Design a binder for this molecule. Structure first.
Ligand SMILES: [Mg+2]
Ligand SMILES: [Mg+2]
Ligand SMILES: [Mg+2]
Ligand SMILES: [Mg+2]
Lengths: 231, 239
């Protein structure tokens, strides 16, 4: 049975190490991390600051692709967006929402043609009124250390303009038009969209599910270029 | 490396199993025993969604019955029996449903009237010993702890833990000749004179006391119990 505890311990470790790769909200990632870390502890027997506790910085490091210094930079960047809403002491996990208009004005998102949709996808309500946790989530997914599949999950939601849980040719037309605003003519986008959708739609509905969309991203990788942003 | 790791896991597993098996032997309150047990127990049907193995009572949950069994020397039928005994003592106060863990205290005066305690010369002190306040107003948890300590399956050391306190009339964390004189006079139920009690107690303390103060600590009291086990006849009660 020692083998069974040793296997479960290893599974927990895998969970601990890959929660940052999950298309999940910060609070879900932290809850799963804590549970896995508890199993492990019960069976195995950088410059002071006052914005975050060390626990919450550790949790942020474990649930994102960022270091503790990065988190404190992101805090300053969020504060700058709304200095009269954003608290300077997060130690008691205060909940504050900054409006989408303010977030999208940031230099990192200003020029992105899917900025509003990127921001909304990291909100539970779909309105883009982000907390700090949502803001960290967004830039963790958008960073260069994040896996392609994480970006693809968000990309699938962000490019689903008709909100049907599918990527059709109408969805892809609006997407590629924004991605090629001065590259492809309203009439060449149609052709390219058709070709992609058809080589990827195996069930004959003209609509892509997540798995088919993933395959369509492996080929045509430039659909994920929107989701490479450095903060 | 791994040899070390596997060894570290084996030891943690074995310690957890030992803790689970011996919480019932501990002079602890029920709530503490259940907490330690819970922390240690973690880790350690084909054509039906019904588990094959086969709610005959509405007084306790099965989880409560499991905890009682693991934290005492009683089985589940014994626990249901103890409840009916507790109820009989105060039928208008004791709940018939304990599933939502209600907190109810029965007065000492009512508990010491039990046939199993009435003739015990230390009945008040025994009941008080299983109360957090020292007044003997017992919950069912306290009543179960008391009878688990007094049952025949309970080890000598657990009984001795409580005896050390109950015979400490002067509450100094020691057993002296004065404590023992009061104890032996009660234990002898007037079979001995005052003078005889003094003489027996003097010799007993002198033979067990190893530090010269004429007062026994737990260790010296344990030895004294071993040589004279009738001091522990008070703590053998069957329900
Ligand atoms: Mg769609
Ligand atoms: Mg399809
Ligand atoms: Mg004393
Ligand atoms: Mg002494």
């Amino acid at each position: 049975e020692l083998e069974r505890l040793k296997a479960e311990l290893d599974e927990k470790r895998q969970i601990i190490a890959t929660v940052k790769c999950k298309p999940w909200k910060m609070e879900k990632k932290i809850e799963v991390l804590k549970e896995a870390k508890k199993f492990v502890s019960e069976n195995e027997g950088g410059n002071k600051q006052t914005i975050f506790t060390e626990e919450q910085l550790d949790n942020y490091q474990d649930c994102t692709f960022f270091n503790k210094k990065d988190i404190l930079k992101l805090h300053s960047r969020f504060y700058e967006l709304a200095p009269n809403l954003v608290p300077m002491d997060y130690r008691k996990s205060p909940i504050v929402h900054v409006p989408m208009s303010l977030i999208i004005q940031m230099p990192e998102l200003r020029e992105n043609p899917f900025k509003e949709r990127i921001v909304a996808a990291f909100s539970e309500d779909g309105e883009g009124n982000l907390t700090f946790n949502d803001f960290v989530d967004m830039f963790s997914v958008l960073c260069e250390s994040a896996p392609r599949e994480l970006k693809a999950n968000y990309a699938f939601k962000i490019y689903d303009f008709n909100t049907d849980n599918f990527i059709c040719k109408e969805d892809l037309e609006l997407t590629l038009a924004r991605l090629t605003k001065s590259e492809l003519d309203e009439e060449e986008v149609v052709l390219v969209c058709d070709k992609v959708i058809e080589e990827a739609d195996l069930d004959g509905d003209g609509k892509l599910g997540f798995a088919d969309f993933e395959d369509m991203i492996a080929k045509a990788p430039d659909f994920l270029s929107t989701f490479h942003i450095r903060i």
